[PDB]
Design a protein around this ligand. Structure first.
Ligand SMILES: CCCCCCCCCCCCCCCCCC(=O)OC[C@H](COP(=O)([O-])OCC(O)COP(=O)([O-])OC[C@@H](COC(=O)CCCCCCCCCCCCCCCCC)OC(=O)CCCCCCCCCCCCCCCCC)OC(=O)CCCCCCCCCCCCCCCCC
Ligand SMILES: CCCCCCCCCCCCCCCCCC(=O)OC[C@H](COP(=O)([O-])OCC(O)COP(=O)([O-])OC[C@@H](COC(=O)CCCCCCCCCCCCCCCCC)OC(=O)CCCCCCCCCCCCCCCCC)OC(=O)CCCCCCCCCCCCCCCCC
Ligand SMILES: CCCCCCCCCCCCCCCCC[C@@H](O)O[C@H](CO[C@H](O)CCCCCCCCCCCCCCC)COP(=O)(O)OCC[N+](C)(C)C
Ligand SMILES: N[C@@H](Cc1ccc(O)cc1)C(=O)O
Lengths: 458, 57
C-alpha cells in the first residue's frame, strides 16, 4: 500500500517548496486527492485480509479508519488557516509538516503487520501531537496539558513493550497472522494475569478508561482546533483498534479479567454523562462526551462477541466524525467571542441561522437519532450487553437518557434564548466554516446509506 | 700426561652416548582434552535476513 504512503511523504516537500501564499490551496487539494485514492481500500473480502506485503496489510477494521484519517487531514487544514493568518511562512509550513507527519504515522500504524512496528508507530504519533499542543495552544495551561498527555500515555505503553518482546521470545513471532493462527490459551497464573495487564493497560489509557481519563479534558481543551479534531476523531481509536487486535491472545483470561474494567466503563459512562450536565466550558463538555462514548466502546470490546465488535467499529467511526464536527462548531463561536464560556454568547440562532442548523444536526447525531450509524453502533453494543447480562439495560438505559439531555442542553444554551446585548462583533458565517460543517456531516448520512462499510471484519 | 683445559673448553655443550631410553612422558601428563571440532562448509546468506522484529532484510 505504498500508493498511499508515498503521496503523503510527497506532500511534505510540496509544502516546503510551495509559494508563500499557496500552501493551504496545494495542501488541501492534494490531501483530498489522497483521500480519494485511499477510498479504494474499502473493497474487502469475506474470508481474510488484503495482505499487500510482508510489512503492510489491510483488514475490514482498519480500512474505514484509514479513510477517516485521510479525510480528516483536509478538514484540519481548512479549520486551521483562519487563526494562523498572522503566523510567519516558516511556522505555517512547520504546522502543516506536523499534520502531515501525524497522518503518515497513523496510516502506517493502522496497517502494520507486526506488533512491534505497530507499537513504534503508535508511540511515534506522540511527538507531533505534543508539539502542536504545546507550541500552538492559546493559554498557559497547554504546557501542563502536554505533560499530562505524554506521561499518562507512556506509563501505559512501557509495560506493553516489555510484554511484547517477552511474547516474541516465547512464540517466536509477533506477526499478527501467525499470532492468530498459532493461538494458545492463557492459563490462570499470576504471571499470565500481569501479562494480560501489560497487554491491556496502554490501550485502556488511550481510550481512555474512566479513572485514567484526566489527561483528556486538559489536552483536548488546551489544544488548537486541528489538534482537538485529530485527538478526538482518530487518536482515541488507536486504543480500540489495538485492543481488538491484542485480545486474540488473551483468552480465556479475559473471561474474568474484564470485570473491573467493565464496571469502571459502565459506571464511569454514567458519571461522565452526568458531568456533562454541569459544565461551564463548551469544549470540556465535548471532551467528556467523548469519554462516555469510548466507555461504551470499551464495554463492547471487553465482552468479545461479533455483535459487540461490529457495534464498536461503527461507534468509533461515527464518534470520530461527530466529535470533530462539534469541536469545529465550538471553535467558530470561540473565534468570534474569544471565550469558551458557554453562557457568554446566547441566542445565536437569531444571528446565525445556518450555523444553528449545523448545531442541531451535530447534536442530533450526538444523541444517536435513528437511523444514524451512531445509533447503529450504540444499539448493537446494547444488544450484546443485554445478552451478556440482562441488568446492563439499566445502566445503558440511564446513559441514553442523560446523553440527550446534556446534548440538547448545549444546543439550548447556545442557540436559543435571547442574544447577549453587549456582544456586537458577531459577523456572518464565512463560506469556509459552512463548507467545513457540510464536509463533516454529509459523509455521516452517506455512511448510513451503506452501513456494512463501517461494521468491521465480523 | 694430563693437560689443563684451555679457556672456554669446559663450558662447551658436548654429546653423550647412552643406552638409557629417552623417557616419553617425563612430566606425567594426562591425556589432553579434545578441541572444539572445526568450522567447515561454504558460507550462505542468512535465511530471511536478520530476522530482527519487522525488518525483512
Ligand atoms: C424524511 C423525509 C424524506 C424526504 C426525501 C428527500 C430528503 C433529502 C434530504 C437530503 C439530506 C439532508 C441534507 C443535510 C444537511 C441539511 C441541509 C441544510 O443545511 O439546510 C439548508 C437548506 C436551505 O434552507 P434555508 O431556507 O436556508 O433554512 C436553513 C435554516 O438554517 C433553517 O432550516 P430548517 O429550519 O428548515 O431546518 C433544516 C433541516 C435540515 O436539518 C436536518 O436535520 C437534516 C439532516 C438529517 C438529520 C441528521 C441526524 C439524524 C440521523 C438520521 C440519518 C438519516 C440519513 C439517511 C440517508 C441520507 C443520505 C445522504 O432540519 C429540519 O427541518 C428538521 C430536522 C428534523 C428531522 C427529523 C427526521 C428524523 C429521521 C426520519 C426519517 C429518516 C430516514 C428516512 C427513511 C426511514 C424509513 C422509511 O435547508 C433545507 O432546504 C431544508 C432541509 C430539508 C430537511 C430534510 C429532513 C428529512 C431528511 C432526513 C434524511 C434524508 C433521507 C432521504 C432518504 C429518502 C427518505
Ligand atoms: C531513487 C530511489 C531508488 O533508486 O529506488 C530504488 C529502490 C528499489 O528497491 P526495491 O527492491 O525495488 O523495493 C522493494 C519494495 O520497496 C519493498 O522493499 P523491501 O521489502 O526489501 O523493504 C526493505 C526493508 C529494509 O530497508 C530499510 O530498512 C530502510 C527503509 C527506510 C524506512 C523508512 C523510514 C523513513 C522513510 O525495509 C523494512 O524492512 C521495513 C522496516 C522499515 C521501518 C524502519 C524502522 C523505523 C520505524 C518507522 C519510523 O526503491 C526504494 O529504495 C524504495 C524507496 C525508499
Ligand atoms: C483508577 C483505575 C485504574 C485502572 C483499573 C485497572 C484494574 C486492575 C484490577 C485487577 C483485576 C484482578 C487482578 C487479579 C485477579 C484476581 C485478584 C484477587 O483479588 O482474586 C483472588 C486472589 O486471592 C487473593 O485476593 C490474593 C490477592 C491479594 C493481594 C492483591 C492486592 C489487592 C489489594 C488492592 C490494591 C489496589 C490495586 C490497584 C492500585 C491502583 C482470587 O483467588 P485465587 O484463586 O487464589 O487467585 C487467582 C490467581 N491464581 C489462580 C494464580 C491463584
Ligand atoms: N462482520 C460482518 C460485517 C457485515 C455486516 C453487514 C453486512 O451486510 C455485511 C457484512 C460480516 O458478516
Amino acid at each position: 500500500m505504498l500508493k498511499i504512503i508515498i503521496p503523503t511523504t510527497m506532500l511534505l516537500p510540496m509544502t516546503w517548496m510551495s509559494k508563500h501564499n499557496m500552501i493551504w490551496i496545494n495542501a488541501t487539494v492534494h490531501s483530498l486527492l489522497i483521500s480519494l485514492i485511499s477510498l479504494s481500500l474499502l473493497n474487502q473480502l469475506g474470508e481474510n485480509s488484503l495482505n499487500f506485503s510482508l510489512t503492510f496489510f489491510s483488514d475490514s477494521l482498519s480500512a474505514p479508519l484509514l479513510v477517516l484519517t485521510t479525510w480528516l487531514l483536509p478538514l484540519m487544514l481548512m479549520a486551521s488557516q483562519s487563526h494562523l493568518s498572522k503566523e510567519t511562512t516558516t511556522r505555517k509550513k512547520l504546522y502543516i509538516t506536523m499534520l502531515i507527519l501525524l497522518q503518515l504515522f497513523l496510516i502506517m500504524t493502522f496497517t502494520a503487520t507486526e506488533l512491534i512496528l505497530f507499537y513504534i508507530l503508535f508511540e511515534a504519533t506522540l511527538v507531533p501531537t505534543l508539539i502542536i499542543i504545546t507550541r500552538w495552544g492559546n493559554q498557559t495551561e497547554r504546557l501542563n496539558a502536554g505533560l499530562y498527555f505524554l506521561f499518562y500515555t507512556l506509563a501505559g505503553s512501557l509495560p506493553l513493550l516489555v510484554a511484547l518482546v517477552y511474547i516474541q521470545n516465547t512464540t517466536g513471532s509477533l506477526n499478527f497472522l501467525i499470532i492468530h493462527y498459532w493461538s494458545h490459551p492463557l492459563s490462570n497464573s499470576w504471571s499470565n494475569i500481569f501479562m494480560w495487564l501489560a497487554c491491556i493497560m496502554a490501550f485502556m489509557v488511550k481510550m481512555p478508561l474512566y479513572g485514567l481519563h484526566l489527561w483528556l479534558p486538559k489536552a483536548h481543551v488546551e489544544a488548537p482546533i486541528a489538534g482537538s479534531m485529530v485527538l478526538a476523531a482518530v487518536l482515541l481509536k488507536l486504543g480500540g483498534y489495538g485492543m481488538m487486535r491484542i485480545t486474540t491472545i488473551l483468552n480465556p483470561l479475559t473471561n474474568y479479567m474484564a470485570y473491573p474494567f467493565l464496571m469502571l466503563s459502565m459506571w464511569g459512562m454514567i458519571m461522565t454523562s452526568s458531568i456533562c450536565l454541569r459544565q461551564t466550558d463548551l469544549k470540556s463538555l465535548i471532551a467528556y462526551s467523548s469519554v462516555s462514548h469510548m466507555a461504551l466502546v470499551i464495554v463492547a470490546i471487553m465482552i468479545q462477541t461479533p455483535w459487540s465488535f461490529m457495534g464498536a467499529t461503527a461507534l468509533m467511526i461515527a464518534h470520530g466524525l461527530t466529535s470533530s464536527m462539534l469541536f469545529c462548531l465550538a471553535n467558530t463561536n470561540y473565534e468570534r467571542v474569544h471565550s469558551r464560556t458557554m453562557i457568554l454568547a446566547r441566542g445565536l440562532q437569531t444571528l446565525l441561522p445556518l450555523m444553528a442548523t449545523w448545531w442541531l444536526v451535530a447534536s442530533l447525531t450526538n444523541l444517536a437519532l435513528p437511523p444514524s450509524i451512531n445509533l447503529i453502533g450504540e444499539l448493537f453494543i446494547i444488544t450484546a450487553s443485554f445478552s451478556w447480562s440482562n441488568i446492563t439495560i439499566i445502566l445503558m438505559g440511564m446513559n441514553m437518557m442523560i446523553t440527550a439531555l446534556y446534548s440538547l442542553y448545549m444546543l439550548i444554551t447556545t442557540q436559543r434564548g435571547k442574544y447577549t446585548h453587549h456582544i456586537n462583533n458577531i459577523k456572518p458565517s464565512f463560506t469556509r466554516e459552512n463548507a467545513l460543517m457540510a464536509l463533516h456531516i454529509l459523509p455521516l448520512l452517506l455512511l448510513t446509506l451503506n452501513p456494512k462499510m463501517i461494521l468491521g471484519p465480523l | 700426561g694430563w693437560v689443563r683445559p684451555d679457556l672456554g673448553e669446559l663450558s662447551k655443550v658436548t654429546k653423550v652416548k647412552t643406552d638409557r631410553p629417552l623417557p616419553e612422558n617425563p612430566y606425567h601428563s594426562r591425556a589432553r582434552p579434545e578441541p572444539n571440532p572445526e568450522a567447515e562448509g561454504d558460507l550462505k546468506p542468512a535465511k530471511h535476513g536478520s530476522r530482527l522484529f519487522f525488518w525483512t532484510m
